[PDB]
A paper describes a structure:
The most promising candidate was human retinol binding protein 4 (hRBP4), which transports retinol in plasma. Lipocalins possess a β-barrel fold with an internal hydrophobic ligand-binding pocket, which can bind a range of different hydrophobic small molecules, depending on the shape and biochemical property of the binding pocket.
To investigate the molecular mechanism of the ON-switch, the crystal structure of the hRBP4-A1120-RS3 complex was solved at 1.8-Å resolution (data collection and refinement statistics are summarized in SI Appendix). More precisely, the engineered binder interacts with the two loop regions (shown in yellow in Fig. 4A) that have been described to be switched upon binding of A1120 (31, 32), confirming our hypothesis that these A1120-induced conformational changes enable the construction of a drug-dependent ON-switch. The observation that the presence of RS3 induces minor structural deviations in those loops of around 1.5 to 2 Å (A1120-bound vs. A1120+RS3-bound hRBP4) is not surprising since these loops also interact with the engineered binder. Notably, comparison of those switching loop regions in the retinol-bound vs. either of the two A1120-bound structures revealed RMSD values of around 3.3 to 3.9 Å, despite only minor differences (∼0.4 Å) between the overall structures. In contrast, the small molecule A1120 used in our lipocalin-based ON-switch is almost completely hidden in the ligand-binding pocket of hRBP4.
Numbering used by the authors:
A (entry chain B): 1 to 61
B (entry chain A): 1 to 176
Amino acid sequence: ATVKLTYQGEEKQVDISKIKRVARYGQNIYFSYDEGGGAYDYGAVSEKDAPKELLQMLEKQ
Amino acid sequence: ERDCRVSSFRVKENFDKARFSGTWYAMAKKDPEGLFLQDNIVAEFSVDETGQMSATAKGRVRLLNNWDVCADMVGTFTDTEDPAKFKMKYWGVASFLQKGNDDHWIVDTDYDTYAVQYSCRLLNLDGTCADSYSFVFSRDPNGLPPEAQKIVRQRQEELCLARQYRLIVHNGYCDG
Ligand SMILES: O=C(O)c1ccccc1NC(=O)N1CCC(c2ccccc2C(F)(F)F)CC1
Ligand SMILES: [Zn+2]
Ligand SMILES: [Zn+2]
Ligand SMILES: [Zn+2]
């Protein structure tokens, strides 16, 4: 259900369902729970390691 | 100014890592190709017991038109035969995953007011630079005194980057 992903530099159990911001930036995918876009409120994973459910959310745009 | 070969650029004479340490605010920048810090760019330079220089760089990153974040990077400088030319290995911390390795030249500084930095990432066959970036740093987050401004303009022309810089703000987005 949740996935081991790094968020604000810390290993967290991330529910991909609740991500509200996602973006490809370079070779990495950045994501956030936060609709307000707090300046450091985000996590990231390399494109190659990204869970498919995260990629699906990204590509649906 | 008319010889634009990176080999022919003067850099800071007898550059002094210790006098350069502390906080430098980027007041203007010349972008390289690709992705880059946007504004609110602050660099903190340090010298350890060994004499090895280090720096942190913080600034705003634009992930999407509607999504601005802040990113921190750390850099470690390997000395060259030239006291002002370094090779800088750098990487993002926390959840910023960008990293790389760039030349890092201190083109000029008075250590108390201003500095001009320069990095050529790709050289043309004829020795001119095909992809560079450059910062104008100030000890003051908001401006440079006119004396400094005159010198900076001269150095930009010497780098063959005259009129290619953009002013960039410091509005607290990443430090308050
Ligand atoms: O280089 C990339 O691939 C990149 C990609 C996305 C966003 C930003 C990026 N890179 C930069 O913004 N910069 C400017 C800061 C620079 C740095 C880092 C750490 C310590 C000091 C410095 C110094 F050179 F500015 F002093 C590293 C290159
Ligand atoms: Zn000089
Ligand atoms: Zn001031
Ligand atoms: Zn500030």
